Every structure is written in structure tokens, then in C-alpha cells.
């Protein structure tokens, strides 16, 4: 007995439709971004959600996450490594936040040294990270809550204030030319590498797929959620990613504090009288992000305990303190994020390069997890056709293949394109982009593959799937990339 209206689903993963942080670096590509979101959604997004779902709704596969899906078609070795890119990609994916944080931070305090100064960013980055790390440790009773209050408060609220700020400003006066800048210049070197920010925008969906089952009539109900979710995300990202763009042109947009910058600019027009108001908006931005980050600190390692229960994970990488919160991982990833935070930022050209690079690294890591999803999916399609699926991509072995084949392509393309800069991401220069990024990525691709062989007597607890019904307060106000799916019921609780 399970019923989930198409809108019920939308509401659940609708939470990702908002990626303000990256709004600045979507703007760098001027007007093209509507193009780019179109690709993303049609060639990637969709396909991803399409295949991910069919795999989720398979007899015995609902409780998996593509540790499940993959480990059946591509086999074990592949599920562990693939499922580790749900967790790994997020260690790097943190950077972006920390920068956005410091960017807002800086604008609040008339301290443009928080963004600019790399030496100060690092020290300031960890301070904020390992602080949140602390709090979260104090049990995750709160997270969910704060997040529901936070994302409301901050990520949601400024958006209205931007639309209204940009829209009214566009009313009269004046910066990017809307006519035909629509297509990126394949004329120039770095033109694509931006995609990264756009693919990132869509990654995550695989999370809320299994949510399919509870659904009520996957058939249409579902390809529609996507159609609407994709359209909604494009509209939100298009209106925002552009606002900033209209009032700052491509060369000098600040990647991290780029958002607050747009407000300070658009405001200095509405009536300098309330120019300070912008400072207040920054506080809300930093708040929303802080809440979203704090929710990440704990979550995806819980997502990743399934590997431990199967021994897969080291004998030492399995322990939770009164109230769950397995800590070997949480504290472990924190080091990777901290160690990486001291490498990327405190290293290359300036800042814009450190921000954009962080996205590529996170996207590249996630790409690995996806490649298997598409590859294994086709294995499913073709090696296990006689099987039990609640949701079936609608068309036939054909559409199914061509659909899955397309997405794999889009990924690949995103993977490559990830690796060639223009050398000029608004000043800071990618002289060191392609390398640091090769050694950084090759360094990780390396982790889950080594842990496997390393070594092959059980203990832990039970994990209880979560559903449009359990679901702690305001889970879904969370990002899909990061929600875990199940409570660490130890002591039975």
C-alpha cells in the first residue's frame, strides 16, 4: 500500500532545483546558460533519472542506491567503488560551499580579504568546517530542522529578492546582449569547461528514485515529474544565473562572492538609501548555506555504512557513538575535504580558478559513479531483460538503449570537457589547472579501488529505509546528493 502523486515526488526532489551558489559561474557563460541547462536536463538530467529509476524499481533492488543497481550488473567491485563516489564526490563538493560562505561572509564585514586572500581563506575555511563538524557531532537531532528553517530562510528568500531586484532594474536603464550569444564560442579555448557547473546542478537525482515505488503510477506521473523538475530547475537557474549576468558581464564576475556582488550592484540603483540592506541579505545567504553544509557533515556517511555492514569497509572504519553518527568516516572525509581545501585554494592562480577547479574535481569524481550506472544499466537492459521492474522506460529495448547511450555520452563529454580550461577564468590563470586536477582526480579514483583489495566477524546495526512517510522532519528540504536513506537503528531506536 503506497501512493505518491506526481506532485508528491516533485516536491521531494524539488529541493535541488535551487543552486544559488553556483549562480555566479553560470553567468560567466553569458546567455548561453539557457542552452546549457537545456542540454543538461535533456541529454543528462533526464536520462539519469530515467535509467536510475528503472533500476530502483526492480524486484529486490529498491533498497540499494546504485550500490545495489550497479553491484548486480557490473558486479561487486563496481558497486563499492560506484557507491563510494556518492560519498567521495561530496568531500570535494564541500569546497564550493566554504567559498560561498566566505564570499557572503566577506561582504557582510567589509572584508574583501576573505575571498581574495587565499592564505586567509584556508584558515577561515577549516575554522568554519571543523566548527560545523563539532556541532553536528552533538547528535543530528537538529539538522533536518535547521535546514528546513534555513533553506527557507536563506536560499529561498534571497531568490525572491533577486528576481524582484533584477526584474525591476531591467525595467529601465543599464549588459550582456540577449540576441545570439546563445551558443558558446567553440571559437575560444576554455569555452566549454563551464559545463561542469551545469552538470553539477543536476547531479543527485539517483537519490530520490526508489521513491518511485511508493509512487502511484510511475508510467506518466513520472517522466513528467522530471519534465517539470527539469523545467523548474532551468527556470530558476535561468532567471538567477542571468540576473547576475545582466548586471555583471562575463570577464569580471566573482565566482564565490559573485552573488552578493550582484545585489550590491543592483541595490546601488534602487536607492543607495538602503544599500546597506544588501549586507543583511548576505547574512541570510551565509545562514542558508551554513545549514545546508551542517546537514552534509553527517548524512552521506550514514548513506555509506551499508558497505561496512558487509565488511567491505575496513574493520576500523565501522563505529558509531551513542546516537549513530558513525565517526570514522565523518571525521575521515573531513580530513580529505580539509586536506583538499589546503591544496586547491592555497595553490593555483587566484580564486576563480580555485572555485571552478573545485567543481570539476567534484564533477569528475561523480562522473565515475555515473559511468557505471549507465554501463550497468545497459547490462541490465540486455543481460537481464526477463526481470521484475515496477517502472520501465517507455519505448522498448530501442529507446531504452539509445536513451541510456545518450546519457553516457553526455557524461563522458562532461568528463573530458572538465579538463581543459581557457587559462583565463576571470583573471586567475589555468597554468596549473589541467595537472593539479589530473593528479587530484587520479588520487581518488584510487581510493575505493585500493580499500577493496587491501583486505576482505560482523557487527553493527539495522538500517531502516525512509519513505515519503517516515522521513524526519524536513529531509526533503535537504539536497538529494546528501540525504541518507535510513536511520541507524541501534539499540533499536
Curated annotation (Swiss-Prot):
Where is the protein localized?
Cell inner membrane
Q: How does activity depend on pH?
A: Inactive at pH 6.5 or above.
Give the family, as the similarity comment puts it.
Belongs to the amino acid-polyamine-organocation (APC) superfamily. Glutamate:GABA antiporter (GGA) (TC 2.A.3.7) family.
Q: What induces it?
A: By acidic conditions. Expression is regulated by a complex system involving RpoS, cAMP, CRP, EvgAS, H-NS, GadE, GadW and GadX. The level of involvement for each regulator varies depending upon the growth phase and the medium.
Gene Ontology annotations of biological process type? amino acid transport; intracellular pH elevation
Impact upon substituting residue 206 to A: At least 90% decrease in substrate transport
Q: Which UniProt keywords apply?
A: Amino-acid transport, Antiport, Cell inner membrane, Cell membrane, Membrane, Transmembrane, Transmembrane helix, Transport
Question: Cell membrane among the record's keywords?
Answer: yes
Topology term for the membrane: Multi-pass membrane protein
InterPro entries, from UniProt? AA/rel_permease1 (IPR002293), APC_superfamily (IPR050367), Glu_antiport (IPR004759)
What result follows from mutating residue 483 to A?
Answer: Allows substrate transport at pH 6.5
Q: What is this protein called?
A: Glutamate/gamma-aminobutyrate antiporter
Cite the effect that the entry attributes to residue 200 to A: 70% decrease in substrate transport
Result, substituting residue 486 to A: Allows substrate transport at pH 6.5
Which parts of the chain does the record assign to the membrane side Cytoplasmic? 56-76, 139-142, 214-217, 311-325, 385-397, 456-493
Amino acid at each position: 500500500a503506497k501512493q505518491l502523486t506526481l506532485l508528491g515526488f516533485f516536491a521531494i526532489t524539488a529541493s535541488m532545483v535551487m543552486a544559488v551558489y553556483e549562480y555566479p559561474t553560470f553567468a560567466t557563460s553569458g546567455f548561453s546558460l539557457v542552452f546549457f541547462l537545456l542540454l543538461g536536463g535533456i541529454l543528462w538530467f533526464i536520462p539519469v533519472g530515467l535509467c536510475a529509476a528503472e533500476m530502483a524499481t526492480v524486484d529486490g533492488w529498491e533498497e540499494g542506491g546504485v550500490f545495489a543497481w550497479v553491484s548486480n550488473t557490473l558486479g561487486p567491485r563496481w558497486g563499492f567503488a560506484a557507491i563510494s563516489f556518492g560519498y567521495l564526490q561530496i568531500a570535494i563538493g564541500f569546497i564550493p560551499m566554504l567559498y560561498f560562505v566566505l564570499g557572503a561572509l566577506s561582504y557582510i564585514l567589509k572584508w574583501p580579504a576573505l575571498n581574495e586572500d587565499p592564505i586567509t581563506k584556508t584558515i577561515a575555511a577549516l575554522i568554519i568546517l571543523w566548527a560545523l563538524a563539532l556541532t553536528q557531532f552533538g547528535g543530528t537531532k537538529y539538522t533536518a530542522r535547521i535546514a528546513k528553517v534555513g533553506f527557507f530562510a536563506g536560499i529561498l528568500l534571497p531568490a525572491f529578492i533577486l528576481i524582484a531586484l533584477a526584474a525591476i532594474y531591467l525595467h529601465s536603464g543599464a549588459i550582456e546582449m540577449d540576441s545570439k550569444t546563445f551558443f558558446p564560442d567553440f571559437s575560444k579555448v576554455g569555452t566549454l569547461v563551464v559545463f561542469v557547473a551545469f552538470i553539477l546542478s543536476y547531479m543527485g537525482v539517483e537519490a530520490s528514485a526508489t521513491h518511485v515505488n511508493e509512487m502511484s503510477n510511475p508510467g506518466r506521473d513520472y517522466p513528467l515529474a522530471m519534465l517539470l523538475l527539469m523545467v523548474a530547475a532551468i527556470c530558476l537557474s535561468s532567471v538567477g544565473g542571468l540576473s547576475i549576468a545582466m548586471v555583471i558581464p562575463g570577464n569580471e564576475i566573482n565566482l564565490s562572492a559573485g552573488v552578493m556582488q550582484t545585489f550590491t550592484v543592483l541595490m546601488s540603483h534602487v536607492a543607495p538609501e538602503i544599500e546597506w540592506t544588501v549586507r543583511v541579505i548576505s547574512a541570510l545567504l551565509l545562514l542558508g548555506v551554513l545549514a545546508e553544509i551542517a546537514s552534509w557533515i553527517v548524512g552521506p556517511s550514514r548513506g555509506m555504512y551499508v558497505t561496512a555492514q558487509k565488511n567491505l569497509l575496513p574493520a576500523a572504519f565501522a563505529k558509531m557513538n551513542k546516537n549513530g553518527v558513525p565517526v570514522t568516516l565523518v571525521i575521515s572525509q573531513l580530513v580529505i575535504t580539509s586536506i583538499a581545501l589546503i591544496i586547491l585554494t592555497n595553490t593555483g592562480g587566484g580564486n576563480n580558478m580555485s572555485f571552478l577547479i573545485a567543481l570539476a574535481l567534484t564533477v569528475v569524481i561523480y562522473l565515475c559513479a555515473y559511468f557505471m550506472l549507465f554501463i550497468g544499466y545497459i547490462v541490465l537492459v540486455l543481460k537481464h531483460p526477463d526481470l521484475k521492474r515496477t517502472f520501465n522506460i517507455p519505448g522498448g529495448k530501442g529507446v531504452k538503449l539509445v536513451v541510456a547511450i545518450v546519457g553516457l555520452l553526455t557524461s563522458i563529454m562532461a568528463f573530458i570537457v572538465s579538463f581543459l580550461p581557457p587559462d583565463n577564468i576571470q583573471g586567475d590563470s589555468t597554468d596549473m589547472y589541467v595537472e593539479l586536477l589530473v593528479v587530484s582526480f587520479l588520487v581518488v579514483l584510487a581510493l575505493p579501488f585500493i580499500l577493496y583489495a587491501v583486505h576482505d566477524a560482523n557487527t553493527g546495526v539495522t538500517l531502516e529505509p525512509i519513505n515519503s512517510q517516515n522521513a524526519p522532519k524536513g529531509h526533503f528540504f535537504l539536497h538529494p546528493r546528501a540525504r541518507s536513506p535510513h536511520y541507524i537503528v541501534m539499540n533499536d531506536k
